[PDB]
Symmetry: D2
């Protein structure tokens, strides 16, 4: 179950069948201000040229940012969803792992912003994602 925050008795999609569980993401640490996650590179994470697909780093970042926000706001009657993701790609990843670290930089009443760094096994900065997370009252 990816070590995601446990905020509800039931979720619509079991984690392992999600896009996230399919490609094998796992959350390591999570606090209100910071969170980390990682994944092993396999072909399922790659595109046909053999590099990790840009959308894999975006998916990693948005799950980490979104769920770190859910962790806080769910018990407050709020829902949180990705509203925008700007990801830039500095160095490709061919194999090994991708490690993500999300740092909360603003927590507003309606929008939280996380900066997510994505590093290879050598610790080099391969991508960054700025995630903006919409926070809204839950619908009934």
């Amino acid at each position: 179950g990816g070590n995601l925050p446990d905020v509800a008795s039931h979720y619509p999609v079991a984690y392992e069948q999600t896009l996230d569980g399919t490609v094998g993401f796992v959350i390591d640490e999570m606090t209100p201000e910071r969170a980390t996650a990682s994944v092993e590179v396999t072909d399922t994470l790659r595109q046909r040229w053999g590099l990790v697909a840009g959308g894999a780093y975006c998916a990693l970042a948005e799950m980490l940012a979104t769920e770190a926000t859910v962790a806080v706001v769910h018990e407050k009657g709020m829902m949180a969803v990705g509203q925008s993701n700007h990801t830039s790609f500095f160095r490709p990843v061919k194999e090994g792992h991708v490690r993500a670290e999300a740092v909360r930089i603003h927590a507003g009443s309606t929008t939280w912003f996380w900066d997510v760094s994505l590093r290879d096994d050598a610790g080099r900065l391969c991508a960054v994602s700025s995630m903006s997370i919409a926070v809204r009252p839950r619908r009934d």
Copy 2:
């Protein structure tokens, strides 16, 4: 597979095994200025809350934009990779298909820029992605 441009005799990773083949993306039209693709929504595309993951829209966008660039520049001795992807999420998608249309808006010597709209089965605009593609001389 998935009807990508056939520009080389073999590829590092078989399409059906890539992230893109796993989630079921299929390219329909492709021209130097415009390309379309679509995918059937299934759990493998969703996150745990039962909506299509933002990363899925981003990966559909970047494949369509990048591969549409490859189809032109590969024979000219160039490589094309995603360098930035800014995606914004307007309406969630729970089920059906996601249909993408990529329109080329600038074709520089070093950077091509594509705007990709992602629509649900009702035609509603659920996400947009601005793809910047780096075009460089092949190393090998």
Copy 3:
């Protein structure tokens, strides 16, 4: 007064003393779904290398997008403000004019999105800005 929409008896800053009036922006057309604006290039719009400063195209886009939203939402008791601007720069402008055209692509209850194209005197696409406009109940 830049032909901005007249929605209030008093504004805190006279338009001519604004950043916008300083560099000489003027709105030409405005509807709920589309709006246009232009400016003459002068040194005040340039940076020290003699090209139009990237922030000039961003300022043009955000005023056009924001105020086209104000035009609709003000009389509804709402305020509208720029929440994010992603601008990409395809060709520099040395002299002449910059013309902007803003197309509304999503109008949500809390967020409207405008795509803004910025063209030179030859009609070439020099920059694009994706403006996301936050819409909130006015404070008292």
Copy 4:
């Protein structure tokens, strides 16, 4: 003026006459990895609603990031221009100063990337800008 890097004997436009000189931007520190600048808020920086215009944060960011790149690459025969600017707006600024700190996060051969934070007099983070800078061989 404004304490920019002095890398050439003359410049196309005198700084005091540029957009940047008109609004009063001043660079404080500059190193190959980090740079700071600030500006006093006056009407010339604001829009009509009395808040600092988003374009002002963007122009302060892009000048600091681009000029910090110029200071390194100019002597190597390169030019540096802003190619993308993604700025997000967290808290408005009504008066005081805006202080910017640019941190270099990637220095590629063709693209440098800078993250610029913009803070008010209380130290609060009011906007962030991700600057991508293109680095190319000079034409003349």
